[PDB]
Amino acid sequence: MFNQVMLVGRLTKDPDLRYTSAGAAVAHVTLAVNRSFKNASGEIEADYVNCTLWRKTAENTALYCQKGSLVGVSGRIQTRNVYVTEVLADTVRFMDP
Amino acid sequence: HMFNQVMLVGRLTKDPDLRYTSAGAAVAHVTLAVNRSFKNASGEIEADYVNCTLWRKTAENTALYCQKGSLVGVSGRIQTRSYEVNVYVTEVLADTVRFMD
Amino acid sequence: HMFNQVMLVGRLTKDPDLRYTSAGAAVAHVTLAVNRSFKNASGEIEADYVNCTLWRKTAENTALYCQKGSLVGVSGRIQTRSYEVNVYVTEVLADTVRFMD
Amino acid sequence: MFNQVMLVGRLTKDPDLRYTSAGAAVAHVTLAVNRSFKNASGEIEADYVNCTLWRKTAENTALYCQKGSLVGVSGRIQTRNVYVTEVLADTVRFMDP
DNA sequence: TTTT
DNA sequence: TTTT
DNA sequence: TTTTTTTTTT
DNA sequence: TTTT
DNA sequence: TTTT
DNA sequence: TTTTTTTTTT
């Protein structure tokens, strides 16, 4: 029984690097992933996936990616009145030339 | 330039919700409890609850064959939506589902 | 009781091999170079070379649109075969492919 | 650019636990995964996937699973005249009641 | 060389 | 506000 | 630039 | 609150 | 015996 | 027990 996600998209904003009171880096990025087909009106829409990164992954994503950066992410769908649902990234690939 | 896929194995929290669009298309809403590998501070196994939408025959078949409790394997893509008091939803749109009971 | 899925993003090592069964079905053979995340003892990036089989329109389309070098995203399942001097093959049978160029 | 595999099948043999000359446990299991449809003759065939496990994963798989055990595995397709291609498992789940 |  |  | 479909409510 |  |  | 198809050579 597992939970696995592969996304490659583009960051909609500079990554949001914060630190927990314990000292752990944690970042929130949102990935625009265009679809592969057009809708009735002939347009390509994107899905906007919120991913949360931790520690070194978070710091490095922040260092090396801005708004617009092409990024690969794998991880799991996590879920946390407040009904939130994100991808918890364990590895990030930087794909900017 | 872009890619979006997901694979999941989990149990249905409730019987599937089988509806038809006024066009005539079957669509189903299902929520999967996916138990984590690790444990918490109390030594318990928490699950993540992922909402999946199914379409056409997949919707009907999972309706017909699975119910609350059914172990199900799903592959598809994450999709995001807003509706209206404006809400943000992220689901998995299932392409296939495997009945694992 | 069972489940088998794979997702892959890699580059084609050669133009796709488009054939037709004597039934009339398009089928394509493609090998994907999937570069690893880590590095070796020399600090180089090695790739894994995964053979994928495509069918019907997917075979034709990937034939028509991709060539040696094309970045491609694939999802499907692992399948195993023996033929005849008897050989053991494991491939990925692609359900979908995304053209990522 | 990634490589991810989810299998849940049944071991065809007791796991093959060996140790490298350095001391690392390494195991080779083969997973029977039945398909979901019948072939022309009305039969369900299986795919037999060779997976290689390392270290603690290898030792634990050996300890707790025999021929017949239901097992979940995620990992990547690895490839190594000798033309071999397996799944390199990073996590194994034991699903035997 | 293939499992319930 | 959820499954075994 | 394409797959089977790319389509509803919550 | 959405990217090339 | 392979891709960027 | 079902999805679109469950079908070839290497």
From Swiss-Prot, chains B, C:
Phosphorylated by YwqD, which increases ssDNA affinity; dephosphorylated by YwqE. The modification Phosphotyrosine is found at residue 83. Residues 2-101 form the SSB domain. GO terms for cellular component: cytoplasm; nucleoid. Pfam families: SSB. Transmembrane segments: none annotated. Gene3D superfamilies: Nucleic acid-binding proteins. InterPro entries: NA-bd_OB-fold, Primosome_PriB/ssb, ssDNA-bd. The keyword Metal-binding does not apply. It comes from the Bacteria. Induction: Only expressed during growth in minimal medium, strongly induced when cells enter stationary phase with highest levels reached about 2 hours after transition to stationary phase. Expression activated by ComK. Keywords: Competence, Cytoplasm, DNA recombination, DNA-binding, Phosphoprotein. GO terms for biological process: DNA recombination; DNA replication; establishment of competence for transformation. Disruption phenotype: Transformation efficiency drops 10- to 50-fold. Destabilization of DprA. Not essential for replication of the chromosome, but is required for optimal competence. Binds ssDNA, binding is facilitated by DprA, acts as an accessory factor for homologous DNA strand exchange. Homotetramer. This is Single-stranded DNA-binding protein B. It comes from Bacillus subtilis (strain 168).
